Amino acid sequence: AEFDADVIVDARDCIMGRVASQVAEQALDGETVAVVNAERAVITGREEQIVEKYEKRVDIGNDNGYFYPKRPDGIFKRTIRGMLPHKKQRGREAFESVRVYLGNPYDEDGEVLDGTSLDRLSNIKFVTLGEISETLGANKTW
Amino acid sequence: PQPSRPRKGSLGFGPRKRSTSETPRFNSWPSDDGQPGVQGFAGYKAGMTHVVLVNDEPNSPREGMEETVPVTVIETPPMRAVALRAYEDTPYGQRPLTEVWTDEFHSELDRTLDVPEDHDPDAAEEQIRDAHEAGDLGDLRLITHTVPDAVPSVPKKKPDVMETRVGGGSVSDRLDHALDIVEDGGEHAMNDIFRAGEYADVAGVTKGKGTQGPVKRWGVQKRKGKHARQGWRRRIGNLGPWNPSRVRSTVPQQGQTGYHQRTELNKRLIDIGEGDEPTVDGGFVNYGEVDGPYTLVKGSVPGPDKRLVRFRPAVRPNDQPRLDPEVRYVSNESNQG
Amino acid sequence: KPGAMYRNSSKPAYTRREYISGIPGKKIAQFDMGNNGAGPTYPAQVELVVEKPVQIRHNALEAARVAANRYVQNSGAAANYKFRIRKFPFHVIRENKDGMRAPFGKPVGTAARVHGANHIFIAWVNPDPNVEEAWRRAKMKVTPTINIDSSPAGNA
Amino acid sequence: PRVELEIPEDVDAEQDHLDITVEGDNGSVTRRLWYPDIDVSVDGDTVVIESDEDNAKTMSTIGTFQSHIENMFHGVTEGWEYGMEVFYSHFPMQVNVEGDEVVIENFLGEKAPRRTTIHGDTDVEIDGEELTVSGPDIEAVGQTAADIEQLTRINDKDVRVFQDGVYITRKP
Amino acid sequence: MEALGADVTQGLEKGSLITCADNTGARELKVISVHGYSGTKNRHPKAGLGDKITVSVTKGTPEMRRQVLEAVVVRQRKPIRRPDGTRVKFEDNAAVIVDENEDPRGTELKGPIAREVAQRFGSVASAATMIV
RNA sequence: CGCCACACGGGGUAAGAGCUGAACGCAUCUAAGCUCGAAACCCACUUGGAAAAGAGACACCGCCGAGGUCCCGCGUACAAG
RNA sequence: CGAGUGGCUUGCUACCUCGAUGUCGGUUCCCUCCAUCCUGCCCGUGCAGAAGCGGGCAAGGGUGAGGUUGUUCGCCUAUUAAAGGAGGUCGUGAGCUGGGUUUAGACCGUCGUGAGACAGGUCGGCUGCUAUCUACUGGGUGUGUAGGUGUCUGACAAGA
RNA sequence: UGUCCCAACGUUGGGCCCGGUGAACUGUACAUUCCAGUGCGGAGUCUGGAGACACCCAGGGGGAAGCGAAGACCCUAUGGA
RNA sequence: AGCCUGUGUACCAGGAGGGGAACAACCCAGAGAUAGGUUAAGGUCCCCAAGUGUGGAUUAAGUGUAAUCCUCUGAAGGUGGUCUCGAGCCCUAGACAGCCGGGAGGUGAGCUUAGAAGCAGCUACCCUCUAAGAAAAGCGUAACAGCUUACCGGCCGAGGUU
Ligand SMILES: [Cl-]
Ligand SMILES: [Cl-]
Ligand SMILES: [Cl-]
Ligand SMILES: [Cl-]
Ligand SMILES: [Cl-]
Ligand SMILES: [Cl-]
Ligand SMILES: [Cl-]
Ligand SMILES: [K+]
Ligand SMILES: [Mg+2]
Ligand SMILES: [Mg+2]
Ligand SMILES: [Mg+2]
Ligand SMILES: [Mg+2]
Ligand SMILES: [Mg+2]
Ligand SMILES: [Mg+2]
Ligand SMILES: [Mg+2]
Ligand SMILES: [Mg+2]
Ligand SMILES: [Mg+2]
Ligand SMILES: [Mg+2]
Ligand SMILES: [Mg+2]
Ligand SMILES: [Mg+2]
Ligand SMILES: [Mg+2]
Ligand SMILES: [Mg+2]
Ligand SMILES: [Mg+2]
Ligand SMILES: [Mg+2]
Ligand SMILES: [Mg+2]
Ligand SMILES: [Mg+2]
Ligand SMILES: [Mg+2]
Ligand SMILES: [Mg+2]
Ligand SMILES: [Mg+2]
Ligand SMILES: [Mg+2]
Ligand SMILES: [Mg+2]
Ligand SMILES: [Mg+2]
Ligand SMILES: [Mg+2]
Ligand code: NA
Ligand code: NA
Ligand code: NA
Ligand code: NA
Ligand code: NA
Ligand code: NA
Ligand code: NA
Ligand code: NA
Ligand code: NA
Ligand code: NA
Ligand code: NA
Ligand code: NA
Ligand code: NA
Ligand code: NA
Ligand code: NA
Ligand code: NA
Ligand code: NA
Ligand code: NA
Ligand code: NA
Ligand code: NA
Ligand code: NA
User: Which B residues 228-257 touch A at CB under 8 Å?
Assistant: First the structure.
């Protein structure tokens, strides 16, 4: 609720990893970032293998635990966390100044980062984070 | 060779820890089929007796014949829906929106709640109707409580409070149905929700047994033969293999046993009456005498005598309802002797 | 015993029968097949070329040869063609069958050393290449991947 | 590459984004034609399927889009019809259309009715031991016919002896 | 099989010795197995009223002795519950030798038999003197 | 050792059965698209779960007093707590 | 005949430990693998049916009781849908057992002049420790979120 | 005939809480770990990830190749008896 | 064999520092202190200093993002998955494929055989009509019939085939 984001990024139809990589770089530069429409973010590849990977992450675990997110919400945030030294003070500070959102709770329309957009007209092998979460068993709350 | 064998006890009711609320909390509700109506009720366990019934089963080679059936007597006096809570759908699931309360309160509801002295029912109702206009309204439930004071055999006067969902025709129709019940005084009874012969799910916190060993808690064997005399009688062989070099939470160990919440499915309601017809001579042991609104549940119910138990229309019934079964005899024979 | 044990040419040449006794006889039945009465006076000449230097036990030679010639009977017992396996198993092979003590092995067989690109088999046929098939079956029983090569034959 | 399909006088074909709709006296069919770098557009009197690539995979889809559209032209005018024949050896098979699904009773003596739901605006008219599956959407009609035949599939016993079932008699 | 129309607490185990309630020439029977039964690790296979068990003859006529036959449990000391809640128990444990078709190998049955055994083995029942 | 209760059904798949369909005018279950289809997967159901660091929501009561601890009689609870 | 995969057997090597990492078999209790014995869904058949044989997907669940033997293995019996195989320091002795191997006593056979020996058999022949850390099963006290009562939400977690 | 199927209830002494008395074993250091990898090929400490708010009570002993004993087996010594 | 045993050499042992996730001997590099600068190996999307660099092409498997190696497997065999280069032959005198039509008679050849007629077996395999048509390439029949290949014509229209 209420997040003074210096930058509001729109993930719709963008390559999750390429966005995450930039959002990481920016948060480590002191910027407060908000990623919007996470459910509509995308990752290239064969849906079948992609889903197997994430499903494997859900099944992995033990008493010590391996909490892997199912909602497009967390998937994206965990993706960003992997590009930050989240256990160091600086890393945790940056990570905590980044938040991902399902849809867009803001008035402004986020901006599209360079080189992160995927052209649906020249690409058929890709998947929506939202679709991934549905496969994982998430509750489509979007 | 080492023969195979199922593990000891289920891994689906854990962790096996002490329940947070002695008052059960359903985590599921029936589907919105029929007319609007509260989807649950509560009562206090009293004891057991048996009753002779006429075989009601259309597929039984015995249909129509006498039949002895165990029953647990539960005192089910009227409860009171003291408010209507509204939920709104959000990207993070459902969240309470607002509540519509009344002014008529049971003399001792203040033993549990800080009873409202100033509330704006209409504003609440407005906010809810707006929500519904916008289409963000999530299910509708009623804040309910019991009147232990109406049950002499039960020491408490402090009422037990729980939220029960309201499932009905349209959202608008049942929203109205909710408000109607609340506004009055919320006073409702077992009759209004259940009919003898229907299947209900009964939830409740089981009888506590404090700390118990693996044998009792998980069903592991006792040491056998010569092993039973060496110094070990009720201890498992080992806490696991060399590797992984850690004890897995799946190995049966000592701990709290009992006093857990359980939702026992498909319990048939044999009868719903009022009076002392079901009471036993000498009185129900460790309970007392029954003489008021009661419900006869087929079989057993989780929890000890006096504990609060909750009813809910079965969410996954196997059989079709066979209303008002003929009861030819209810035993009142003393439970002592 | 698997070919894994002897297919490599990492050992010294070991073929001097004057210093080696008890060498098992070869299982290869013949080296000249078909019409050996006639000389290579045929239109087409196909060859089975080995593509990697390897050792081929007399075991594999016989099975490879049989599988090829036994099939070349798509032309008949006295058919018009001549088949030649040009290599002979000269290399004597051992096995250490005590542990690694006094391990010099005892003679257990023989193998032929073929260098990549040599032809192990050469058939002579009239435009009737059933031989091309006889070889698909032959390089099936020898360790290396092989090249089926046709020389005199621009009758494609 | 680029192919041009002159639309029939009897038809009107509109298309926004990746969806094409074809309407005729017999109905309307809308399809999604989505493939990397293949543009499908309605240029007045002709539908155009073009792309800047000529690799095998691209040509394959272009040819597929073509037959898909022509098939739609045909479905909105002449229409599509599959003919079927119910057949039984001992137990009189009863095939009826009830609601939006065809039900088959007494199959090989079975007490439990076998059924399947019809796809789209496909008409399954049954007359005696003859069935006619028709509609403007070849995809839908084709499946409905197929599902009907599949509905009598048997794996448990020898099919050569137990031949009961409904079969496609005439393919459009 | 068909419902016995009564709940049973198996009172017999693999190895138990029981009476042969017929005139086949076999006096004592030793239980070996229970038809259609599968237990669990360490559990002794159990058998009670109405079960068809495989058996061996321990006592009786030389020709009958040592033979491995089939039989049906007709009586047991351990209680059983009838629909009306009443419990029923017998003075001894007994079985009657049966064949492939479940027809008593003998001509006469000695002693009473539980009514529930009728709802399963007709020919055995229709050969009973007393059916309680 | 006694008694009660413990689904079905949706969704997506594998092997497999097919539809439409091109590369390759034909053919083709597959390349794009689609219909079905496992005790397996997801949901459903039961249990735990505000320490989920985005550390939550709602209603009322209260900030000179709401509520709570200690105390006393007791257990539907319990090795201390 | 040719090419491989596994790391359960056996052999090889001598890298690790001789200021000791307690043996075999069994038991008890937990997790896993699939090369699937049963169960589900399928394909082929020398598929009429019934009963089979062979193959594919598939590890959810099941795979049990006994007679000889220390046995593992294996032989045998009656049941069974089936009574699959394998890994976890040949899982598991700060858990049990101690029948076998392999101490000191003794006998027999064989060998030795003899002491005595045996990759032969046999009878008898011991099982230590009060848990510091870690791990997990359950139970509390505090702090953080930032006054209280009551009711909820559900990120995730477990289930056969 | 409770050795077993298959375990239950009970009795007495402990265990648990309280007053008083009051040791020992053991300790290079650090130490909230888990999954993998690596390494003299059997890692709480190296590497990558995952998880992880602190303290305390009770428990049964998975790990610290746990503690205890300069290996009895085996070999070696121009050792002993 | 992370085996045993030679040999030449460089290294570890006794060798830091940079790189290689970690890691005696692999790469750079041989090093007094301190300071500024430029490179080496290696690297430049983030973690992480430096490119989401440029021209062009391939790959759809998450192949791959793995110099060396106990350590990074993947083989014989197979692939109308796809891209590129070559050669031969056919083709607007209309090819390849498909669809339509024609596939005729002497004559159901002779022989054998109850039989045999394109098609059990044996021999032969001729000539007529014609724009085609085997003494019949594959099914089928008890033998016929029937269904088709070869062969010809039409429709179509551009590359096709090896
Ligand atoms: Cl986990
Ligand atoms: Cl970090
Ligand atoms: Cl694509
Ligand atoms: Cl034991
Ligand atoms: Cl048995
Ligand atoms: Cl130097
Ligand atoms: Cl990936
Ligand atoms: K040692
Ligand atoms: Mg002992
Ligand atoms: Mg009593
Ligand atoms: Mg009584
Ligand atoms: Mg059959
Ligand atoms: Mg046992
Ligand atoms: Mg140890
Ligand atoms: Mg498999
Ligand atoms: Mg499993
Ligand atoms: Mg072991
Ligand atoms: Mg084991
Ligand atoms: Mg141990
Ligand atoms: Mg010990
Ligand atoms: Mg101890
Ligand atoms: Mg012993
Ligand atoms: Mg002994
Ligand atoms: Mg002994
Ligand atoms: Mg803090
Ligand atoms: Mg770490
Ligand atoms: Mg020593
Ligand atoms: Mg010695
Ligand atoms: Mg001496
Ligand atoms: Mg040194
Ligand atoms: Mg940088
Ligand atoms: Mg890979
Ligand atoms: Mg390599
Ligand atoms: Na990707
Ligand atoms: Na996980
Ligand atoms: Na002891
Ligand atoms: Na003892
Ligand atoms: Na151990
Ligand atoms: Na030797
Ligand atoms: Na080969
Ligand atoms: Na399904
Ligand atoms: Na909180
Ligand atoms: Na040591
Ligand atoms: Na053991
Ligand atoms: Na399984
Ligand atoms: Na045995
Ligand atoms: Na060990
Ligand atoms: Na011990
Ligand atoms: Na042991
Ligand atoms: Na006892
Ligand atoms: Na331990
Ligand atoms: Na040096
Ligand atoms: Na390094
Ligand atoms: Na990959």
Answer: 246, 248-249
CB contact under 8 A, B61 and E5: yes
- Residue B238: CA atoms inside 13 Å, Cβ hemisphere, count? 6
> Which CATH entry fits the domain spanning D80-172: 3.40.50.410, 3.40.640.10, 3.90.930.12, 3.40.710.10?
3.90.930.12
- The protein residues having a beta carbon less than 7 Å from any atom of strand H are A 62-68, 78, 81-82, 86-87; B 215-216, 221-222, 224-225, 228, 232, 235-236, 238-247, 253-254; E 13, 40, 42-44, 46
Determination technique for this entry: X-ray
Please tell me if residue B5 touches chain A, with a CB cutoff of 8 Å: no
The number of C-beta contacts closer than 8 angstroms across B and E is 20
What topology is assigned to C1-156 in CATH? Aldehyde Oxidoreductase; domain 3 (3.90.1170)
Domain containing B321 equals: 39-77+189-206+258-337
Of B127, B135, B79, the C-alpha closest to B99 is B127
Alpha-carbon span A67 to A86, nearest angstrom? 16
Q: Mind giving me the DSSP string for E3-72?
A: --SSEE---EETT-EEEE-BSSSEEEEEEEEETT----TTPPPEE-TT-EEEEEEEEE-TTTTT-EEEEE
Touching chains, E (3+ CB pairs < 8 A): B
Nearest to E85 among B5, B65, B68 (CB): B68
Give D1-79's CATH code, choosing from 3.90.930.12, 3.90.226.10, 3.30.565.10, 2.70.70.10.
3.90.930.12
Contact A122 D34 (CB under 8 A): no
